[PDB]
Design a protein around this ligand. Structure first.
Ligand SMILES: [Mg+2]
Ligand SMILES: [Mg+2]
Ligand SMILES: [Mg+2]
Ligand SMILES: [Mg+2]
Ligand SMILES: [Mg+2]
Ligand SMILES: [Mg+2]
Ligand SMILES: [Mg+2]
Ligand SMILES: [Mg+2]
Ligand SMILES: [Mg+2]
Ligand SMILES: [Mg+2]
Ligand SMILES: [Mg+2]
Ligand SMILES: [Mg+2]
Ligand SMILES: [Mg+2]
Ligand SMILES: [Mg+2]
Ligand SMILES: [Mg+2]
Ligand SMILES: [Mg+2]
Ligand SMILES: [Mg+2]
Ligand SMILES: [Mg+2]
Ligand SMILES: [Mg+2]
Ligand SMILES: [Mg+2]
Ligand SMILES: [Zn+2]
Lengths: 223, 153, 110, 307, 115
RNA sequence: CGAUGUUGGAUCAGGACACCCAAAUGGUGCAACCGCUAUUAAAGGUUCGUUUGUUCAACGAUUAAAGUCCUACGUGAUCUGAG
């Protein structure tokens, strides 16, 4: 069974000219944090349950379950969004990974979906935003390589929170043949910026950095 | 406010800029030495350096091929990139390009001009600036210091 | 908005003979060790670069005669030669351009 | 005589350039590590702490920003200020400067020799430090004075404290009236011609001039401001990093001037602080890798549970 | 970010709340000094051609991290005394509301689900 | 009168104090809470809407308050043009 290293996306530093030291510091601290709280591997579309410390509840713990809509951040600040419908009310929460108020993160389902971010579940029929609050964790063999769920989605009628048809978004996850006219699809294509893919210089390189910080992580396990 | 903007605006817009650099690149890969507006040559130099690193990725890599497809316009050149340029850069990581300022254009628009080049080409060599020789008085005074950094160690 | 009065010649001399509108003297000029013409220190010598340009053009002309058309460019490296020269073992297997002129002093054999 | 322009590099051969670089960098290492031992050289007399006293400051380097949490659950954002090479340079006595307080001149991070001026290089030559990028002047009560040529470290500030950070703000260039002042514009659509941004009326009919204070388009942002009342949370002793509270004026990677807060409520806080300044030599005990405030959740910890 | 002239959704069971009308219930005036309402903010509401007061429960505008963000702009019909005019509230509500007991006591009493 | 382009808005406001708010006080047919008066004080403030071209005015909701005025009934070589 071949193992390709999975790197939690927040160890990847941003592209700016920020001094590389700052990131070393931040990483030491979040690796320190990882020793207490165990942060699992997961991707957008995977379903998580998060336990929080809440002062105002009866049991000081607060559970929330939902699909991961997006991950963004870097360093200590990195966040993820969980989406779930309750009683017909769509609800999202935005959790900071490294916040000490977080007790435990539990992956109920490890999954990829066709898009790096799906915010469009806001505009989809409510089923894709709904999950059983009590649903039990499901386990996998690694060699299945984080199975990519291929599911196109049904939409409410336009307008939508954003225009998902536009090329800047790159969404394969929506079912567009049911939603739109061929004319609206030619229309969306006037915003296409083909040259961007071939721009070379626009592309960000990592691999040297990733080698470095992976080295750093191993050096954090050893001690 | 221009803060941390790496690319300069050229041509009729962003796309026109890409096509400008397209032609310049094609020209560079064909003739191996060209001269143009100092700003445009400066802009190009990045792409001309990365193209060679897509050439190093080999004929068989698909990404490198449709990359060289888009950027090299006369399709005849795409082999030359892979089977001539990319091989003759092997040892060197980044050293592919030489860019020098030429005297301002003799036309009435009096532009700022640069020559840009792929190293190791077969052409009369540019009259590069030479450093001073070591026999020069000041350098000879430094050689003394050096030989006394050796003698005292 | 229209000027209320003619500007006097004294005022105008003040504006245009001002130090900031004067052509500023370039202190970076020097002589090219090769041909002894003039050049700025951060720029190639115009003259020498003209020699190189002419020769480059001739080479390109004659390597345009070896290519029967627009889109044929060699899949091999090329080497340029002059009167009384022969391709080395290291340089064979390459496209050869043969020029009439004797090999120029600045141009080395390599 | 038409004497031509010249720079440090110009006449050196390809041989001598690496040599000269080695020469300079090596003497920089020597010089910095020589003044590394302040207390054993000829320390100026250390005085005890008087009530109305004021300490020296630092010249730090804005790194970036980071989140940080407090045991009550609240989130904070902090600015990392790294002290790089910080030395006191000269000392102007009380009667020679303000007639009130003495002045210590502190240097910022090291720069290249070649791009400074004969005067300045002479000033450092007679000192024995390498040239500093930025140099600021600190007002200091005469019991606080140190000896020029002395290092200053991040430990000079203890966690929980308040500081003042001065720097050049981010230069936004020549700006319109809306960004520079915050005038509303005129409405966009309802038939306005070419006005949607302009300042409007700039004055009164009768006054017949425009007053001197009048807010108008112009340069914005490259200029010095000071942040006050900044709590310091955490100190990293290995890399010399101060974590201050909130935003500090200037662009990241710029040099900055820190001192204790001159705000009234914090006036006498100095008594518990390492004063003339901090001396890593004298105590002969190391400090922990990090010093924290007592409200700060640490990078490892119980992971707070309310009860 | 509820403000003047927003259309809101009355969550609780109510006479005014549930029964249809041709104009959706609108926000007239928010009782904050900023003209903008947030979670746990008083509001004046025009419903069915009369004014009633409301408490903002949840809203679509993002907020501090780990705060719930909702798919509709939710209110609780409310009288002058701070007495909820509804019997009970089905749809979920911010736990953050429990920070203020003094005002929201009687309203938090009739709440079912906390998120 | 060989032109000193005119109402209301917009923008930006400069000023007075004959003070609407904020501060300090005297008197009360001032117990307290409110108020009604008068003195001193002009650094800073003085809301959003429905109808009117409107300034006024009426009305809805508020505010610590929604001041009175002068500035070519401030301000069209900055805008508007409903009148
Ligand atoms: Mg929207
Ligand atoms: Mg142009
Ligand atoms: Mg700038
Ligand atoms: Mg506007
Ligand atoms: Mg018009
Ligand atoms: Mg017009
Ligand atoms: Mg317009
Ligand atoms: Mg006057
Ligand atoms: Mg009615
Ligand atoms: Mg007249
Ligand atoms: Mg006249
Ligand atoms: Mg005013
Ligand atoms: Mg008065
Ligand atoms: Mg009062
Ligand atoms: Mg006033
Ligand atoms: Mg009048
Ligand atoms: Mg007027
Ligand atoms: Mg007018
Ligand atoms: Mg006009
Ligand atoms: Mg005018
Ligand atoms: Zn020459």
């Amino acid at each position: 069974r071949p193992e390709t290293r999975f790197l939690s996306p927040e160890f990847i530093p941003p592209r700016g000219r920020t001094n590389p030291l700052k990131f070393q510091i931040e990483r030491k601290d979040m690796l320190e944090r990882r020793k207490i709280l165990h942060i699992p591997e997961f991707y957008v579309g995977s379903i998580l349950r998060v336990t929080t410390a809440d002062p105002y509840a009866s049991a000081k713990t607060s559970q929330f379950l939902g699909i991961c809509i997006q991950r963004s951040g870097s360093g200590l600040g990195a966040t993820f969004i969980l989406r779930n419908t309750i009683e017909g009310q769509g609800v999202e929460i935005c959790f900071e990974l490294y916040n000490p108020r977080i007790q435990e993160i539990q992956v109920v389902k490890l999954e990829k979906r066709l898009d790096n971010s799906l915010l469009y579940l806001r505009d989809a029929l409510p089923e894709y935003s709904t999950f059983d609050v009590n649903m039990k964790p499901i386990t996998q063999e690694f060699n299945q390589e984080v199975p990519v769920n291929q599911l196109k989605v049904k939409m409410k009628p336009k307008p939508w929170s954003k225009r998902w048809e536009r090329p800047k978004f790159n969404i394969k996850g929506i079912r567009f043949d049911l939603c739109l006219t061929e004319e609206q699809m030619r229309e969306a294509q006037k915003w296409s910026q083909p040259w961007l893919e071939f721009d070379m210089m626009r592309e960000y390189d990592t691999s040297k950095i990733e080698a470095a910080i992976w080295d750093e992580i191993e050096a954090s396990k050893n001690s | 406010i221009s803060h941390g903007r790496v690319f300069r605006r050229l041509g009729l817009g962003p796309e026109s800029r890409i096509h400008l650099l397209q032609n310049l690149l094609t020209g560079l890969v064909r003739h191996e030495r060209i001269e143009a507006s100092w700003a445009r040559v400066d802009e190009l130099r990045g792409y001309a350096e990365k193209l060679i690193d897509y050439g190093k990725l080999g004929d068989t890599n698909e990404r490198a091929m449709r990359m060289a497809d888009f950027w090299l316009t006369e399709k005849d050149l795409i082999p030359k990139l892979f089977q001539v340029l990319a091989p003759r850069f092997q040892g060197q990581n980044g050293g592919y390009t030489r860019m020098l300022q030429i005297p301002n254009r003799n036309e009435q628009d009096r532009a700022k001009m640069a020559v840009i080049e792929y190293k190791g080409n077969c052409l009369p060599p540019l009259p590069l600036p030479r450093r001073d020789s070591n026999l020069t008085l000041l350098n000879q005074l430094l050689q003394g210091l050096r030989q006394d950094q050796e003698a005292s160690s | 908005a229209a000027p209320k009065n003619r500007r006097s010649i004294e005022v105008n001399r003040c504006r245009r003979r001002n130090p900031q509108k004067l052509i500023k003297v370039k202190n970076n000029i020097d002589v090219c060790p090769e041909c002894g013409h003039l050049k700025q220190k951060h720029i190639l010598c115009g003259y020498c670069y003209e020699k190189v340009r002419k020769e480059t053009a001739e080479i390109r002309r004659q390597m345009g005669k070896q290519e029967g058309g627009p889109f044929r460019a060699p899949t091999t490296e090329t080497v340029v030669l002059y009167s009384g020269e022969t391709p080395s073992e290291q340089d064979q297997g390459k496209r050869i351009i043969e020029r009439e002129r004797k090999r120029p002093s600045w141009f080395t054999q390599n | 005589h038409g004497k031509s322009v010249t720079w440090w590099d110009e006449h050196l051969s390809e041989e001598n350039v690496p040599f000269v670089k080695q020469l300079v960098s090596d003497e920089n290492k020597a010089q910095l590590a020589s003044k590394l031992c302040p207390l054993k050289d000829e320390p100026w007399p250390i005085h005890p702490w008087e009530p109305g006293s004021s300490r020296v400051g630092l010249i730090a380097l804005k790194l970036g920003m980071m989140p940080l949490w407090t045991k009550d659950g609240q989130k904070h954002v902090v600015t990392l200020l790294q002290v790089q090479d910080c030395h006191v340079l000269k000392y102007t006595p009380k009667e020679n400067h303000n007639g009130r307080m003495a002045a210590l001149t502190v240097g910022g991070k090291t720069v290249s020799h070649f791009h400074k001026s004969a005067s300045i290089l002479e000033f450092y030559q007679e000192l024995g430090l390498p040239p500093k990028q930025k140099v600021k002047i600190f007002n200091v009560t005469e019991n606080a004075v140190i000896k020029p040529g002395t290092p200053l470290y991040a430990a000079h500030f203890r966690p929980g404290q308040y500081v003042d950070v001065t720097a050049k703000t981010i230069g936004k260039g020549f700006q319109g009236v809306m960004r520079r002042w915050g005038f509303k514009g005129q409405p966009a659509t309802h038939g306005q011609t070419k006005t949607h941004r302009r300042p409007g009326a700039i004055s009164t009919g009768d006054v017949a001039r425009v007053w001197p204070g009048t807010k108008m388009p112009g340069q914005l942002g490259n200029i010095d401001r000071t942040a006050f009342g900044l709590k310091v949370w955490r100190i990293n002793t290995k890399h010399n990093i101060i974590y201050v509270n909130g935003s500090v004026p200037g662009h990241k990677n710029c040099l900055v001037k820190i001192k204790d807060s001159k705000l009234p409520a914090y006036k006498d806080f100095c008594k518990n602080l390492p004063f003339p300044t901090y001396f890593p030599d004298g105590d002969e005990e190391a400090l922990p890798e990090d010093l924290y405030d007592e409200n700060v959740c640490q990078p490892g910890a119980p992971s707070i549970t309310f009860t | 970010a509820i403000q003047k002239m927003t259309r809101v959704r009355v969550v609780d069971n109510s006479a005014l709340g549930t029964t249809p009308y041709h104009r959706p219930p609108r926000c007239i005036h928010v009782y904050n000094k900023t003209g903008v309402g947030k979670v746990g903010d008083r509001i004046l509401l025009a419903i069915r051609g009369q004014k009633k007061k409301a408490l903002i429960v949840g809203h679509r505008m993002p907020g501090p991290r780990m705060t719930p963000r909702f798919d509709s702009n939710n209110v609780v019909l409310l009288e002058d005394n701070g007495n909820p005019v509804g019997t009970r509230i089905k749809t979920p509500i911010p736990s953050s509301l429990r920070q203020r007991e003094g005002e929201f006591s009687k309203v938090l009493a009739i709440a079912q689900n906390f998120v």
